[PDB]
Subunit: 336 residues, 3 copies
């Protein structure tokens, strides 16, 4: 026990899909790691036809940034709700024990801020999300979630206890969105956040999302914004879904080691084609690239991916390996 | 073999969320454990606006009571269908081998009763449900399911083979309900069970539940009816869903050890934030409370929980632990 | 490396639910295994009321046939798209590494054919499916998927490393179908494949299937077409779902050993009542029959099974075992 004896570090958060610099295995000791996050309500364009979402976010982004600590650290968050916002908010860390994830101790009306500490005594990727009483699903589906990664002190491990590592970490929040439609069957635009509410609840209750998006927008992780890697590189793909199940898949790739339930004291599974993230959870997959090219990373309900938007790209540099894959005969007429 | 050489015990069932008294590890030997259950059709109020369900139940409750035996025992059930009921019924134990779970050997018109025996040769929590030919989903979604827990003879075990135990067992049946609506868009009330049928089937086919409820009602496990524990206590949370997937989560807590597929010869997983119960199955989680307070136990599709009703509370007594969690700065104005 | 040094074998594919002859454990060495498949677009009757699907298939069947190799082999597929078809097509093997599963190297307009080779370096059942740019979900949901099983060289293994085997392999593709309805609320019939498109997309986007079917049709694996086994026999049930989650269950039976994620380097789970196939994946269960009779194999969302069609039968010959299950008292009046 006593956390007050311990050294402090301040961490500067970065925007998804990146994750702030951290060590995997560490020789360092339990610290009190300090973070600050600032809630921002805002309208966002979520697709290529100018449909908007009256959104709510931690730190301006969907998802919130990923916070990283080691098992044994103490997370200390200053949560700030500017008076420029319209709603109260709080925070529920699934990584934390007591007070409803910290939601009870972090209720912040606009103009307020609070500071929570909890011990990160359990390794894994864990969702955090806003949970204001009477209003939980709305705040979550409107964008208010992210990931806390608690790495084992000696870093990641395979089922045999052998070390595993990644060279690059990426963070993907998947967001099932419930955008209301007018009598004309066009999506509704709302002047304020409060005004989106009633109509939104009614779409939510149909359990049918209008949109399902990575990192805030259809196409968010495509084009200039595609993720990147090199043949030989190991990536950790962190995938959070605070409200609905999803099934990540890397087209042309695999999940070399996957913790689908996101909890690193458990052995991961290997060679996965498609894994499963349970709504209300974050999972983690390692992949070491072996072929160059553009890969698709997606929800493998293909409707949810291609029709609804749950899909991104990874652009991978390096040398083609004909042993792994070879075009023997290119497309050509069927021999007469 | 031969079951006829064996001693008999009669078990007196109790109503959910409690589970009848049983031993975990036992020095005792294979018995023929005798149970009796009586089907009851009845109208139930399922939410706080007086919406009713033309329900069908084992022993008067949703879910049915939980039956407990040890691996190697023989379950012997007398299933009674009173002439005061309108439908035939039977029973399908997923814990059992042959005759479609026992459904073929237990077809009981109103006024009849039958007695089934099967060997409980496989450990785990297992769903049982009514499965009358031509009418299976209807009977299941209208309430006719429950759990058979078959404990290992030497009790529960962690992945390393170390003993695990619970001090208190709770049983939660989650029920996706398909209540029809009138042209006025109000829920339909039906004078008889038979009359609910056609309209219900049509809602079912949309795969969109009107309600999703723990133990028969919205708010069933809240207020006076909240579950209870103490700091230091280990609870086993048994969660059945005979028809639809769900994703249990304990807010402010974890799944210390979880058998999401519900089968105790498999190693459980640890530190889970959210687990997954496959429709047609029962799972089991252990949690040892470390902080006092009211916890929410819920389906972490938050729409299904807060809008539709898949949520309950656990009221936990004891001493707050500031090491685990501490309000450093309560909500207060953002410093100018 | 070099695949060109290696011997070739030609495999003759068979129609589901059968799987072409293969060895489990093998003393043989890495070969280049050659397959050819021919795409066929066609109208199919999918239920007992003459509803049709403008379908697209590999080799004339839903699902495609199952291709079997051993870990270390090279799969070499000649994919043929006859000029009698209307669409371009390709193939994405989840078992393969690079070029989007091989989709990029296999784009075949009608009248063309291509040949792909990749190394099957990872054991498991893996989905393959057509993935033509701009048109992926449509081709997949209209029938274009199947399984590649890559067996370990020394065959299947339990979590302790002990050998496992099957005597009979069956392959089940489950297909969520999105059949449009007219203003009269009857299913739409389409003269051409291209004409089904726009309406189909709109049903897809509701994420509500009109039909969910094993192997192309409601009742496909029932009656004369039921699967078969004997008491004492071990079956491997391969279950693919290229687009949507499903939850296989064997009524009256179990999953003795189950790889729900379908990847044989992972330990399987035992005693499962219901397992979970993630959309975009194939899983595998072993079961050794202990009782004769007709079993139901189904998606245990019972609505999806009985209302929508995700259910088949297994007819099992042999001797009843009263130790496992016994009708103690048949149905008879409740004693006065
Ligand atoms: Cu909020
Ligand atoms: Cu939560
Ligand atoms: Cu019944
Ligand atoms: Cu069942
Ligand atoms: Cu195609
Ligand atoms: Cu795919
Ligand atoms: Zn590396
Ligand atoms: Zn205890
Ligand atoms: Zn055998």
């Amino acid at each position: 026990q006593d956390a007050d004896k311990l050294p402090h570090t301040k961490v500067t958060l970065v925007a998804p899909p990146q994750v702030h610099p951290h060590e995997q295995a560490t020789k360092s000791g339990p610290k009190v790691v300090e973070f600050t996050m600032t809630i921002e309500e805002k309208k966002m364009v979520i697709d290529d036809k100018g449909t908007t979402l009256q959104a709510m976010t931690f730190n301006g982004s969907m998802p919130g940034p990923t916070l990283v600590v080691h098992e044994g650290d103490y997370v200390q968050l200053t949560l700030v709700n500017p008076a420029t916002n319209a709603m109260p908010h709080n925070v529920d860390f699934h990584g934390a024990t007591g007070a409803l994830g910290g939601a009870k101790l972090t209720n912040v009306n606009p103009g307020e801020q609070a500071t929570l500490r909890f011990k990160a005594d359990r390794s894994g990727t864990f969702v955090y999300h806003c949970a204001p009483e009477g209003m939980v699903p709305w705040h979550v589906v409107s964008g208010m979630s992210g990931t806390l990664m608690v790495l084992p002190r000696d870093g990641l491990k395979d089922p045999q206890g052998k070390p595993l590592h990644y060279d690059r970490a990426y963070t993907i929040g998947e967001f099932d969105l419930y955008i209301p439609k007018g009598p004309d069957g066009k999506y509704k635009d709302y002047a304020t956040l409060a005004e989106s509410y009633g109509d939104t609840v009614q779409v939510m209750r149909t359990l049918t999302p209008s949109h399902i998006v990575f990192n805030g927008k259809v196409g968010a992780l495509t084009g200039a914004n595609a993720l990147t890697a090199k043949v030989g590189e190991t990536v950790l793909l962190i995938h959070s879904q605070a409200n609905r199940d999803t099934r990540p898949h890397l087209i042309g790739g695999h999940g070399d080691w996957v913790w689908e339930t996101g909890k690193f004291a458990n052995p991961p599974q290997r060679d996965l084609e498609t894994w499963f993230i349970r709504g209300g959870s974050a999972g983690a997959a390692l992949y070491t690239f072996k072929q160059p090219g553009v890969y698709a990373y997606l929800n493998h309900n293909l409707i949810e991916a291609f029709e609804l938007g749950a899909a991104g790209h990874i652009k991978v540099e390096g040398k083609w390996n004909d042993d792994l894959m070879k075009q023997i005969k290119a497309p050509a007429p069927i021999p007469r």
